């Protein structure tokens, strides 16, 4: 299928263990996509001081339309140094490896994949 139903967990930023997918956009894309497959994938919701506790380069998920099921359609979208890598919306958070942190709550997200 071209979309996936996920629901991925919600972590507090000091909670997450693993503070991003790699070291290039190309791998953090990569990495983003599997971890979302595997199920092994957690969302930290961007605000004031989140993005400085994780590491570059960033995985967004993005708005992709104005949601099937409870399901908000995103799409991916990386970033290093100011720059990004794929065009979306609004940021619904950034991902993380998710490794057995305790979530706050769940996000349903339709995975353009």
Same mark, same amino acid.
């Given at each position: ?8 967990? $919600?972590?507090?930023?000091?909670? $997450?263990?693993?503070? !991003?997918? #790699?070291?290039? $956009? =190309? =791998?953090?894309?990569? @990495? ?6 595997? !199920?092994?994938? #957690?969302?930290?919701?961007? =605000? ?7 590491? *570059?380069? %960033?995985?967004? +998920? ?7 099921? !409870? ?6 979208v990386?970033?290093? @140094? #100011? +720059? *990004?890598y794929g065009?979306?919306? =609004? ?8 490794? #057995?942190?305790?979530? $706050?709550? %769940? ?7």
């Amino acid at each position: 299928k071209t979309h996936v139903q996920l629901s991925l967990p $919600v972590l507090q930023v000091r909670d $997450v263990l693993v503070r !991003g997918f #790699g070291d290039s $956009v =190309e =791998e953090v894309l990569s @990495e983003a996509r599997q971890h979302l497959k595997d !199920g092994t994938c #957690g969302l930290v919701e961007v =605000e004031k001081g989140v993005l400085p506790q994780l590491e *570059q380069p %960033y995985v967004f +998920i993005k708005r992709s339309d104005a949601a099937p099921h !409870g399901h908000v359609m995103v799409e991916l979208v990386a970033e290093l @140094e #100011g +720059i *990004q890598y794929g065009r979306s919306g =609004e940021t619904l958070g950034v991902l993380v490896p998710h490794v #057995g942190e305790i979530p $706050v709550a %769940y996000r349903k997200v339709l995975l353009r994949k």
